Design a protein around this ligand. Sequence first.
Ligand code: MG
Length: 287
Amino acid sequence: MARCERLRGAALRDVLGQAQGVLFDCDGVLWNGERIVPGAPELLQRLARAGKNTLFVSNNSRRARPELALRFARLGFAGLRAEQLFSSALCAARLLRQRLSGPSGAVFVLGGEGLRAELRAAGLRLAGDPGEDPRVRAVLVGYDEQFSFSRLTEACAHLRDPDCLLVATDRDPWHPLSDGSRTPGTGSLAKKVETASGRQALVVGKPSPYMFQCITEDFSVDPARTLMVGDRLETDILFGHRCGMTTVLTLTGVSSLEEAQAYLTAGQRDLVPHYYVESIADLMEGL
Ligand SMILES: [Mg+2]
């Protein structure tokens, strides 16, 4: 029964000591734009040497795994493997691969090159690619910098066919840019498409539990022995509760302690973290 307690001292040593793994959200937790959270790279190294699994979850779709791995290495996060990285783009690609199996058809993507790349790596054919004309069997909505009313209308035409799937990477209100600014996230486009088409999308990214299924397909992950660390209550903490994980709010990102406390006293227990730290650097003393 959470809680929102301060994670340090004996509590920290116990909670971290029993943990077999830690799942980290990235933006607002490891970094903000190109500003790394002080102590973040060292924590990850200490966790690995402590024998604990470290996995990474993000609703950012700008980078496919290879490029995402290269980013981690640039900001000073060494010794990570691509297999530890779980983006909403990766999980959407794997969902679509399964649903479009039994080999037919193509995916119409509202989104960028990183998303397209992950889909191609899952062996999916895309509607915008050459040798065109295949039937569109799914529309995938992701963060789309080049969105236009022309492509919305195109997407809705494909969705006239009830058999055409509608999938969204996530419903985040905001997408963080490298320069510290932000712009509306997939949430706005998803609702636009859902409203225009009169449909409800299959959402794969957190707080959807499907992201967790994606993870547990590749890794042995006991949710009762795993910490979920994030900076947004409505996405990361909710995700943790839905998956049965211990949740930790870090304060270096979007959500504030006051917000955490407002949900508590308002009875929204799924939006209240079990614990909080000022930054993930504070977890290092538990090791
Ligand atoms: Mg975040």
